[PDB]
Enzyme design. Structure first.
Site, PDB file in Angstrom:
ATOM      1  N   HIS J  22     -16.752  12.077 -11.412  1.00 55.71           N
ATOM      2  CA  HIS J  22     -17.268  11.491 -11.302  1.00 55.71           C
ATOM      3  C   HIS J  22     -16.197  10.659 -12.723  1.00 55.71           C
ATOM      4  O   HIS J  22     -15.593  10.737 -12.917  1.00 55.71           O
ATOM      5  CB  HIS J  22     -18.236  11.898 -12.742  1.00 55.71           C
ATOM      6  CG  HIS J  22     -19.373  10.610 -13.547  1.00 55.71           C
ATOM      7  ND1 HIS J  22     -19.726  10.546 -14.582  1.00 55.71           N
ATOM      8  CD2 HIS J  22     -20.252  10.300 -12.201  1.00 55.71           C
ATOM      9  CE1 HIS J  22     -20.722   9.988 -14.764  1.00 55.71           C
ATOM     10  NE2 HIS J  22     -20.869   9.077 -13.291  1.00 55.71           N
ATOM     11  N   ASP J  30      -8.654  -4.198   3.623  1.00 52.14           N
ATOM     12  CA  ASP J  30      -8.509  -4.892   4.608  1.00 52.14           C
ATOM     13  C   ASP J  30      -6.783  -4.618   4.960  1.00 52.14           C
ATOM     14  O   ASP J  30      -6.235  -3.970   4.308  1.00 52.14           O
ATOM     15  CB  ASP J  30      -8.788  -6.208   5.172  1.00 52.14           C
ATOM     16  CG  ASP J  30      -7.990  -7.276   4.143  1.00 52.14           C
ATOM     17  OD1 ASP J  30      -6.816  -6.988   3.322  1.00 52.14           O
ATOM     18  OD2 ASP J  30      -8.203  -8.148   3.377  1.00 52.14           O
ATOM     19  N   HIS J 108     -10.048 -11.508  -7.906  1.00 54.42           N
ATOM     20  CA  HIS J 108      -9.568 -10.706  -6.667  1.00 54.42           C
ATOM     21  C   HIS J 108      -7.829  -9.782  -7.571  1.00 54.42           C
ATOM     22  O   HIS J 108      -7.406  -9.249  -7.284  1.00 54.42           O
ATOM     23  CB  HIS J 108      -8.822 -11.592  -5.672  1.00 54.42           C
ATOM     24  CG  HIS J 108      -7.600 -10.891  -4.043  1.00 54.42           C
ATOM     25  ND1 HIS J 108      -8.753  -9.702  -3.798  1.00 54.42           N
ATOM     26  CD2 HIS J 108      -6.705 -10.994  -3.917  1.00 54.42           C
ATOM     27  CE1 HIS J 108      -7.430  -9.398  -3.144  1.00 54.42           C
ATOM     28  NE2 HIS J 108      -6.663 -10.293  -2.940  1.00 54.42           N
ATOM     29  N   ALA J 131     -12.021  -8.608   2.656  1.00 58.46           N
ATOM     30  CA  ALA J 131     -12.488  -7.030   2.795  1.00 58.46           C
ATOM     31  C   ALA J 131     -12.132  -6.268   2.525  1.00 58.46           C
ATOM     32  O   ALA J 131     -11.509  -5.322   2.742  1.00 58.46           O
ATOM     33  CB  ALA J 131     -12.387  -7.345   4.515  1.00 58.46           C
ATOM     34  N   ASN J 132     -12.505  -6.035   0.902  1.00 57.55           N
ATOM     35  CA  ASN J 132     -11.882  -4.647   0.086  1.00 57.55           C
ATOM     36  C   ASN J 132     -13.241  -4.477  -0.729  1.00 57.55           C
ATOM     37  O   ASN J 132     -14.050  -5.457  -0.876  1.00 57.55           O
ATOM     38  CB  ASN J 132     -11.491  -5.275  -0.646  1.00 57.55           C
ATOM     39  CG  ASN J 132      -9.617  -6.218   0.288  1.00 57.55           C
ATOM     40  OD1 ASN J 132      -8.887  -5.650   0.870  1.00 57.55           O
ATOM     41  ND2 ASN J 132      -9.267  -7.100  -0.125  1.00 57.55           N
TER      42      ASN J 132
END
EC number: 5.4.99.62
Lengths: 140, 141, 141, 140, 140, 141, 140, 141, 141, 141
Positions: J22, J30, J108, J131-132
């Site tokens: 957990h 990407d 980012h 694309a992460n």
């Protein structure tokens, strides 16, 4: 009789010297100096006085370009004979190298701390007091 | 100056001698002997003649119980001074140990093969020819 | 500029040469030779022709005592210019060493097998054919 | 019957003693002391009381040059018999060494922290309370 | 004082015994037996006679189920006292285990070869001759 | 059937319990607890409910001397059945040990932090909520 | 409550099953089988009977595609109850898989040799005799 | 003659370049630069001037997408010819990449500190002063 | 979007290809092939059919010089569509390489044995039968 | 064809997912994202677009219980098509899981820092921007 030409025959010493860059240090010490685990240990000590401190310093400095040496202040009073031999040797070395080797002194406690940052400590069989030097790599 | 009492100061030599059992071997060799990778390498060689073959043999045998020594046949003719110094040393050692050290000779080729079975090869700075000995661990019961 | 005095500057080459004993071998090869996993790989190839086979052989032999060299028979016909350059270099090396370097030839298939027994294969950027040599360590006594 | 001459037969103990320098420490402890993972663990304990704390201290000090010893203050009240035996032994050792072994006391909590800096902890089979000592390497 | 309940306190001995399966072997040896590198080395030897061969065999067999024991034929003539003590002990062990422990003898040379296949060799401080046994794990 | 006498059969559990000293901790956790990489991971979980949290706690405490246990506060309201079974077990354990086991409660967040200091986390197949305990090693002097 | 969906929760078991290719084997064994060092050891044994042989076989075969099973001939006479439960389970498994699982028998000695070639041995807490199976990976 | 198509032939260089992400750095240095142990060491130095700093920079940048370069201020005055050759090369590189490569300068002391954060230092045989560059990975997106 | 120029983006693939010499082999296999432990495992399989056998073969061969390919005889009858797509691809590859790629067939049992000698096996997500190829490194010289 | 039942076929992905607890995180990224060395690197990138970001997210989430997802704010403007595809997928995933997946956004730069704390970064072949995603493990109770 060795397969390596020259006079620096030890495999570990050759290896570490070939990895040195500018300002990296290498320690040559006596039979009683503690060696921190943050540093590589090259144990050349065979027995009392073999090899001597000077024999090791001399051999190491045949392959290593030295710009500076650090010593414990305690060497001056407590091992003056060895102190003077070392200074004479560093004087000849700098002439051969065509530079000037800077000598400085710190307390032994501080010296031990500086040894933590060296690339390796080469242990000799020397039994006289404070027979330890930090050699700094450098060329003009 | 050292923290270990006695005269065998090297950490690797101490370590390997303390791991030895009966019939285990330890090699003391000269500056040019090849060392097989099936064996541990203890490189004491600093520079030509430092430390000498005899200095290393002597120090090692202060801690090691020796029951035999193996040599290259080639040492007899090509390094007779060292041969006779070693035989004298082994003669004194056996007296101090209370035993009799067996000496044997094989071809150097065969000697090199035997080194593959040793626990370690301690490399000296010796430059004379065929200055290599295989020491066998043993004591009287 | 380097902190090591002399001209053999690579750390891995320095390291392997300092561990050599008599009859140990060291291979200098071209950009295409396969390297067995039973041997250490020292990859000096940067790009085509850099460094050349001769640059690497020359530098290695400044530190290494060489008593013999092994070559593939195929080099004679398929790379005669490099073959001669190498022979001339080995001629000068033996003169400076004061010995005589033995040169021998095997099939390339046999050469590849012998590489499995060397201490290391030092890979150059050489692109010409059969630019591979096995150097054997040795000195006179 | 061992191939090593002398009486310090353990391979790991021999090894760590041979690596010691001035002011490096070695710990000999009882069967219950925790051992930090920043230190090497040499486990000699076989079973309750075998080997004893004293047997280990005695054997270690045949090879090791001792300049000081550190103990938990708790030993004084809670294991006085063992306290005395150790002090007598250290008294005889210093005479044989020709020096004077400094003894000092810290809280057990502080003792445990100092063990984190030692080169190794040699665990004995001792079951009595606070049978732990830090030995410091040194000569003249 | 140990945190593990029972009398087998060594961490390495506990560990190897807990890994044993049927027919796996464990060796208890004297201070002089060579130990092949194909086997784990558990060095319990502190000094001459400490701990004894019997102390180790006894402690190991409190946790280990033994179905067989192998000895060198040389023990019969050259260490008869120890031979008997071991046979009596194995006699009591088999009674406590409710089985029958098979004893067999090989040449010492052959004994050394069998040690190459064991899971570990536990080295004692014993100095008497041929005080070595291979114990084989098994139950009903 | 096993070669180890007694009932704690797992090799890793035996190994870690035999390395414990006073105040060292061991964690037994449920199928979903994260395990920090500063601690050893002993993964006993086979499948849902196998082995249960209590089966693991029970077996571990047959070999381990326990002086304290730490729990998440969340277990009281969200897993009261398991809470009371564990308290009963610890009550019997203390009687068999001849001591008194101290129980404490912290937030689960704080509990997870404490697990970073343990010697190992033994993972069970338990699926109920907050089925995690930190066991502290200790005996009476 | 696990973060992994499904019922094969063990990290080592999941890892080895995901590495299997056609004809690779995986052993599930009882609490006393010796495990060769040429093979990975996954020790699931908690205590006597926990987890059982069948619990492990059953869980492993939920993720592993089985084409064959090998058993010791001794199971037939000496653990017939478990033998029959296993056969029934392998019968249901093959129906679920849409293939036919081949069962074969060798001597136990030979079985132990075959275990040397497996990718891993998963040890259960089973105490009944010869409760060991070699499972071979395969799909139609 | 190599089995890899293209001109970046070194196995370690190929490996490190293929692991680079945006803002990762790769250092190309001269024969004297110290290399911190927090960074991978790729020792291409054979001997003085072989391979040169520019040969290495050139080959690396054929596979690596560069968005910026960092130099020591000292290069301006103490190695101006090399400084200019590098700028020209980075000018042509940015054109072939279709981006604009940012150049900045720090003290050499600070440069050394930044090298501690790179993925690797590739050591050339260059002997001129301050022939060291930190290359930053990036593509226009 | 990657920092490596070109289309072979995987770090392990790039690495292994750059270490290949003449006659070294690299295997591309399907989701079910066993991989011997004497060989490196590069697991590219994400899920059924991703990436496909052909996607992997295609990308590998953009960097790798191929002189020969080995297949299982069983592919002819049991995966003829894939067999044909592979042959066509190897036909186009040899044309772009300017050589001729030799194709041979062995039993699948013997194929598995040969995979023990490769430098790595790259596992694809392919689920069709016998979708396994051994690629041999070589260039015309 | 694979010996593991189900659709998550990669050995390293299977391995890391089976070790998750957990609040542990797993990153799918990407082709250009840098991967800190404090985290394990699972390089699934074969070539541009293979496998896609969504292929990897989809497959990972078939085995992993997800309670939250973190994204870079930059994805909203600079990759809106992929952003929506991912949100739709997370919507269906939470439905099939029977929970509600929390989605949050950071810069980012902050996203890159959070990746240092994950268990692994699984690298896809995706070439589109940002694309992460960071996936957080969790289930309801």
């Amino acid at each position: 009789n060795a397969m390596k030409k020259g006079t620096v025959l030890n495999s570990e010493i050759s290896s570490v010297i070939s990895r040195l860059g500018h300002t990296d240090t290498l320690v040559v010490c006596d039979a009683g100096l503690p060696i921190p685990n943050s540093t590589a240990r090259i144990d050349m000590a065979l027995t009392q006085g073999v090899p001597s401190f000077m024999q090791v310093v001399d051999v190491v400095t045949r392959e290593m370009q030295v710009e500076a040496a650090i010593l414990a202040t305690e060497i001056k009073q407590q091992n003056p004979q060895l102190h003077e031999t070392l200074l004479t040797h560093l004087e000849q070395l700098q002439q051969h190298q065509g530079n000037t080797i800077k000598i400085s002194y710190t307390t032994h406690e501080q010296f031990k701390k500086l040894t933590a940052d060296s690339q390796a400590v080469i242990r000799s069989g020397e039994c006289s007091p404070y027979a330890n030097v930090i050699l700094c790599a450098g060329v003009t």
